[PDB]
Amino acid sequence: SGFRKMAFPSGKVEGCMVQVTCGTTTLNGLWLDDVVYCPRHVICTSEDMLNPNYEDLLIRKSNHNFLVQAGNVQLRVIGHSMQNCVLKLKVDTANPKTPKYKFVRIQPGQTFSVLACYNGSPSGVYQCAMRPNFTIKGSFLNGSCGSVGFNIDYDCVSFCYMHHMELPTGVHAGTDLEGNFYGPFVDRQTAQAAGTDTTITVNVLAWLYAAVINGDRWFLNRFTTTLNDFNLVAMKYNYEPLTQDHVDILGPLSAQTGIAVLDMCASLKELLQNGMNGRTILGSALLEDEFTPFDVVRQCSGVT
Amino acid sequence: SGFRKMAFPSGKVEGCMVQVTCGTTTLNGLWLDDVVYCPRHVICTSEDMLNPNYEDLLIRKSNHNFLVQAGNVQLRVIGHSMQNCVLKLKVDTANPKTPKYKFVRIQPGQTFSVLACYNGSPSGVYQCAMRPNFTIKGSFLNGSCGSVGFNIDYDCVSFCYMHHMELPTGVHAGTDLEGNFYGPFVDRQTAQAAGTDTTITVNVLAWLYAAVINGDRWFLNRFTTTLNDFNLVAMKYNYEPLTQDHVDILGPLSAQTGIAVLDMCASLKELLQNGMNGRTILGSALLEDEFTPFDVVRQCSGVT
Numbered sequence A, B: 001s002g003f004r005k006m007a008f009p010s011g012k013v014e015g016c017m018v019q020v021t022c023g024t025t026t027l028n029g030l031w032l033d034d035v036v037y038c039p040r041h042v043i044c045t046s047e048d049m050l051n052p053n054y055e056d057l058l059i060r061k062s063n064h065n066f067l068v069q070a071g072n073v074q075l076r077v078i079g080h081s082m083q084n085c086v087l088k089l090k091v092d093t094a095n096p097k098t099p100k101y102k103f104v105r106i107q108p109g110q111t112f113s114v115l116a117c118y119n120g121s122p123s124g125v126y127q128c129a130m131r132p133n134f135t136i137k138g139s140f141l142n143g144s145c146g147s148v149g150f151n152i153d154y155d156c157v158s159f160c161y162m163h164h165m166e167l168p169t170g171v172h173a174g175t176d177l178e179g180n181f182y183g184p185f186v187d188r189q190t191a192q193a194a195g196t197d198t199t200i201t202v203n204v205l206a207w208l209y210a211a212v213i214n215g216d217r218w219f220l221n222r223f224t225t226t227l228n229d230f231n232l233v234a235m236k237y238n239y240e241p242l243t244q245d246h247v248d249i250l251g252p253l254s255a256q257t258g259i260a261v262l263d264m265c266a267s268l269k270e271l272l273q274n275g276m277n278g279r280t281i282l283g284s285a286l287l288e289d290e291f292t293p294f295d296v297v298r299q300c301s302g303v304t
């Protein structure tokens, strides 16, 4: 029993983190096989960051200008290319600790673990979600760029995020490992405002299921609703619309608890309309939306 | 910027987790050097757990009855002893992945990372605190016993917790790595009620400092207070008394923000008396008490 905001074990990713230096800029790189992936803004002077022309800036860079250090050992860079907003640095040594891995581009509402690093060294691990506005709410200081987000399926690490920048509002933007930003963001020090940070409804419902499973049941009511009725209330409260696809995904939690998805919707409707009245659910005073239905099943069943 | 509930990178501890089986009971063990540490209740039938006499139960156990598996390789047990509520299984092979380590007994209010494991395999990592009632609020299913809590100082893992049991109220009790329970708890399936779970005041104040550092400042007020006045309010709200030792510990956060500790106390006093009024601090609707002042400094400064 008990339900915690839980990250994947980070060891498989720790073994992949390196330091990348170009000129006076140091940030983190991901070493998989004989390639080191890092944010392309490693080539910029903070002056360059105002309006950088990356292709033009890159012309002035040779293999030997990219200093890649794995622990206290230097890797030999034998090639470099830009793919979207990442650099791929080819090194002469395959990372001996390369896990089984995939690059995935996640959807908004999907959760992942971040291994926050500075100078290629791990400082911490925490759980995030891709927000519906394609930001993440992370913990990233100068030097953390190139830190990665991931999921693990048993022995296979799916890398989904690389950290690139902080918006003026202190929320975070980054890329998949093909260098494509989540959302409309660009690696430039310019006016970039996030859109509405809506609540991930399907994740809230998953977490309400988790609460019931773990004995927190006070919010279960006598009501049901319909997707359309629920969705009118969702809209009003800046919650994402609930689809039949979301209902289908919640089916196993429905099955386990015997609470129909639409009944749990009606409970969530009353919590939105009535608030918590000073009560808590799984030690939270607000409705948590950074657990997926898969997260709840995984944690509640003990998958390794 | 941004402030997250952050665990230590888990890799150094992942390399230490093994499976221990005695009869039909499987749980986790910690392999450091040529010793495997696990809960002594591994020797019990769930029948035994009602009123176990561990010394008597242990007489019936030989080295060869303790099945220790590290990945898919069996370790040879050449000795076993009971120390308090843990077994030490001597194996013929030093764990080649043994990190630098210490065993520490932490105080209430101190935070640590848990690597939740099943069958010696890591499932997740999350941040806990030793509650003032010597429970922890974890996430532990059957099979998770022998999972450990730890802190890392650069390269040295301080092990502070081993998971042993769930109270009827779904909170958790365990031992240090010398097998001594935190609090009054015993490894027996009996009536064990937790005392008052008080709020860790010094940690709340640390987290209020973290909020200011990260731009969440709405709760800063025009008031100050004294330790004695604050403490009258703390008592009323089931907050731990604040000592000058706590004020001293918060000094660096005071220095960095320019907010005197007693001023921040007066802010916390008004939040206790007035509530949050539907507002949030660092994305929380309640006052978070599972960050230590050291945690806030570490995360805000980017220690690896």
Ligand SMILES: *CC(=O)N1CCN(S(=O)(=O)c2ccccc2F)CC1
Binding pocket: A024, A025, A026, A027, A045, A046, A141, A142, A143, A144, A145, A146, A164, A165
């Ligand atoms: C994103 C990231 O982690 N980095 C880019 C900025 N650099 S830096 O130019 O060295 C720097 C250092 C300190 C303050 C601002 C700043 F831009 C660090 C790596």
Ligand SMILES: *CC(=O)N1CCN(S(=O)(=O)c2ccccc2F)CC1
Binding pocket: B024, B025, B026, B027, B045, B046, B141, B142, B143, B144, B145, B146, B164, B165
């Ligand atoms: C604490 C812990 O993780 N364990 C002790 C209980 N055993 S068990 O006896 O195998 C068991 C299994 C399933 C349900 C209850 C139960 F006690 C597992 C390890």
